Ligand binder design. Structure first.
Ligand SMILES: *[C@@H]1O[C@H](CO)[C@@H](O[C@@H]2O[C@H](CO)[C@@H](O)[C@H](O)[C@H]2NC(C)=O)[C@H](O)[C@H]1NC(C)=O
Ligand SMILES: *[C@@H]1O[C@H](CO)[C@@H](O[C@@H]2O[C@H](CO)[C@@H](O)[C@H](O)[C@H]2NC(C)=O)[C@H](O)[C@H]1NC(C)=O
Ligand SMILES: *[C@@H]1O[C@H](CO)[C@@H](O)[C@H](O)[C@H]1NC(C)=O
Ligand SMILES: *[C@@H]1O[C@H](CO)[C@@H](O)[C@H](O)[C@H]1NC(C)=O
Ligand SMILES: *[C@@H]1O[C@H](CO)[C@@H](O)[C@H](O)[C@H]1NC(C)=O
Ligand SMILES: *[C@@H]1O[C@H](CO)[C@@H](O)[C@H](O)[C@H]1NC(C)=O
Ligand SMILES: *[C@@H]1O[C@H](CO)[C@@H](O)[C@H](O)[C@H]1NC(C)=O
Ligand SMILES: *[C@@H]1O[C@H](CO)[C@@H](O)[C@H](O)[C@H]1NC(C)=O
Ligand SMILES: *[C@@H]1O[C@H](CO)[C@@H](O)[C@H](O)[C@H]1NC(C)=O
Ligand SMILES: *[C@@H]1O[C@H](CO)[C@@H](O)[C@H](O)[C@H]1NC(C)=O
Lengths: 164, 219, 46, 49, 46
């Protein structure tokens, strides 16, 4: 080619690069970059650390891994800790609160009022009274002791007095 | 010569931390109380399924290994070397001396005579154990450096080996060798089989004891 | 102070059963994995 | 809800399990190792000759 | 419901209950809960 600067387009030099991706039969190789995002703590989230996928609330911990160890698990083999791959800090994993809901009825033939128990849940995550059976909403906590009427649990009972 | 390991060649088989528990695994291990070859100072050995490899000295006579199927050209092989500088992993097609070594002036490296088609490079008394294995195109290397209070005999005790490297090569392996620094101015080889072990984990997460579950009725 | 085996056994039996229940959440029963986020990631809905 | 789970327009005094409850994930996060092997294409796409 | 059209001769297996394909993913879909028949016959003579 005798290239010259006063050549019409289609006679001027073009530089070409041909990328050819091949896949023999190895174990792996080059791939595209994996974008990430900041880490928030003390909220039920959907996390993903390197491929470790789950959901729950992440707090900071008092464990000490070994430099090559990347996550922890307990008896029954559930993941209960993790290392995040940028801070090099280990974080506790706690499942996000759950439970049952029970309604306390004084009998529909007597009233339409009800109380509600959220079983083994702290009261913040739902007048309002904290038992050892859970959080109880819609019942007043009196100071006298009667015979048990409706069993709530852990020593507490409920009843329709006087009207409430 | 041949010698008897006692409880040797235990490595962490995964990245998982564990507090004070007893965890059971199935993997490739060096059985307890095994028949390990003894070498003094060497020849082409087999691989066939992983390798345990200890060594003892204060100087550094053991200067890496060489791996592969043919240890020559016409097929690819690995080469792991250490001059007085630092480690040099390398993967080409080579032409290896049938008796390859390096001298100690301090001029050396009569190891190979060819370095073609390189597909991977890298550059940068005592008891030094290593476990080499090769699964799904990955060549894993575990290692541990314990100090003996002897010079060159295989001691007794428990010491778990921590993972070092991971190489996505793809290379086939059937044979391996060793490399030594000559004189110009002791090592063992076990093999690994599929066993089932019971590892005792400390509260910091280290393996402190183990049980080989196919030794005897008590185990 | 220096025998309560009948009380210890009912505790042990219940714990041994509850652990076997959770340890079954990691068997395939003839599937590609034990995780639903792995069958919902490398398979189409059909 | 009690009347639904009991299948009846009358209910008698007691305590009744009616449903479950659980907190939902607020958002999603992702973590990964930093970059280092960006792999320079400013040699093949940026050559002098 | 009679749905009547014409396609390329290749993606006749693209009209099926539950599948992936450039014809099935963009121009015509059937539910996996399909119930009915599919008839196809050649046409370049019309
Ligand atoms: C990942 O990269 C970031 C920077 O991109 C590193 O963040 C620094 O961390 C050190 C702590 O060792 C801090 O003193 C610096 O202020 C941080 N700088 C920035 C810009 O965030 C982080 O250490 C790297 N981690 C790894 C494992 O490579
Ligand atoms: C080759 O190198 C040059 C210079 O480093 C790159 O040119 C830059 O391109 C960006 C986006 O078009 C501009 O914002 C910059 O101003 C350019 N550089 C300069 C110095 O002005 C170019 O992107 C590189 N080529 C490739 C393919 O990466
Ligand atoms: C339920 O209601 C009926 C109808 O009002 C009444 O006859 C009966 O006594 C009530 N049952 C009680 C109060 O236990
Ligand atoms: C419930 O949450 C409060 C708020 O942090 C906390 O102080 C308390 O210990 C928790 N448990 C009980 C039983 O109140
Ligand atoms: C119940 O009695 C205790 C006495 O220790 C008192 O502190 C509390 O305020 C009382 N509660 C009510 C609702 O009277
Ligand atoms: C190891 O095997 C060889 C094979 O002949 C045998 O001669 C030797 O006694 C064995 N060593 C031990 C410690 O069992
Ligand atoms: C050590 O050996 C490697 C093997 O190629 C070589 O690259 C390196 O230069 C050697 N060290 C010195 C100081 O030459
Ligand atoms: C490997 O080297 C030989 C000789 O140098 C050469 O013929 C062959 O093309 C090389 N392999 C590849 C994939 O280029
Ligand atoms: C390793 O050698 C075997 C010989 O049986 C061969 O079948 C296999 O393909 C080789 N490995 C690779 C990755 O090609
Ligand atoms: C490691 O374990 C030892 C004994 O089990 C313990 O005393 C120590 O606190 C742990 N943590 C260290 C050394 O950081």
């Amino acid at each position: 080619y005798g290239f010259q600067p006063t050549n019409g387009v289609g006679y001027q030099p073009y530089r070409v690069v041909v990328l050819s991706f091949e896949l023999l039969h190895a174990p792996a190789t080059v791939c595209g970059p994996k974008k990430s995002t900041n880490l928030v703590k003390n909220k039920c989230v959907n996390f993903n650390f390197n491929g470790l996928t789950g959901t729950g609330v992440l707090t900071e911990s008092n464990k000490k891994f070994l430099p090559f160890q990347q996550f922890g698990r307990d008896i029954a083999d559930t993941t209960d800790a993790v290392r995040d791959p940028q801070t090099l800090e280990i974080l506790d994993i706690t499942p996000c609160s759950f439970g049952g809901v029970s309604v306390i009825t004084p009998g529909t033939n007597t009233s339409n009022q009800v109380a509600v128990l959220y079983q083994d849940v702290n009261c913040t995550e739902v007048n309002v009274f904290q038992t050892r059976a859970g959080c109880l909403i819609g019942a007043e906590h009196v100071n006298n002791s009667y015979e048990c009427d409706i069993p709530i649990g852990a020593g507490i009972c409920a009843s329709y007095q006087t009207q409430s | 010569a041949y010698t008897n390991s006692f409880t040797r060649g235990v490595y962490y088989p995964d990245k998982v931390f564990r507090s004070s528990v007893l965890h059971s695994t199935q993997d490739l291990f060096l059985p307890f109380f095994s028949n390990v070859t003894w070498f003094h100072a060497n020849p082409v050995l087999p691989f066939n399924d992983g390798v345990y490899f200890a060594s003892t000295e204060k100087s550094n006579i053991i200067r890496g290994w060489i791996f592969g199927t043919t240890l020559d050209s016409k097929t690819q092989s690995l080469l792991i070397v250490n001059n007085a500088t630092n480690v040099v992993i390398k993967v080409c097609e080579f032409q290896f001396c049938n008796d390859p070594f390096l001298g100690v002036m301090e001029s050396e490296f009569r190891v190979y005579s060819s370095a073609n088609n390189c597909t991977f490079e890298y550059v940068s008394k005592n008891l030094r154990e290593f476990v080499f294995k090769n699964i799904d195109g990955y060549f894993k290397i575990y290692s541990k450096h314990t100090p003996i209070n002897l010079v060159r005999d295989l001691p007794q005790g428990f010491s778990a080996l921590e993972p070092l490297v991971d190489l996505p090569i793809g290379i086939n392996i059937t044979r391996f060798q060793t490399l030594l620094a000559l004189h110009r101015s002791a090592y063992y080889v076990g093999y690994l089989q599929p066993r089932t072990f019971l590892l005792k984990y400390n509260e910091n997460g280290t393996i402190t004891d183990a049980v080989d579950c196919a030794l005897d009725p008590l185990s | 102070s220096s025998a309560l085996g009948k009380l210890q056994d009912v505790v042990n039996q219940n714990a041994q059963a509850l652990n076997t229940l959770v340890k079954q959440l990691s068997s395939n029963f003839g599937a590609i994995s034990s995780v639903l986020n792995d069958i919902l990631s490398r398979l189409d809905p059909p | 809800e009690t009347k639904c789970t009991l299948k009846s327009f009358t209910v008698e005094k007691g305590i009744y399990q009616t449903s479950n409850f659980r907190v939902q994930p607020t958002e999603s996060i992702v973590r990964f190792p930093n970059i280092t092997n960006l792999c320079p294409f400013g040699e093949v796409f940026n050559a002098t000759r | 419901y009679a749905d009547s059209f014409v396609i390329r001769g290749d993606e006749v297996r693209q009209i099926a209950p539950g599948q992936t394909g450039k014809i099935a993913d963009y121009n015509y879909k059937l539910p996996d809960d399909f119930t009915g028949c599919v008839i196809a016959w050649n046409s370049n003579n019309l």
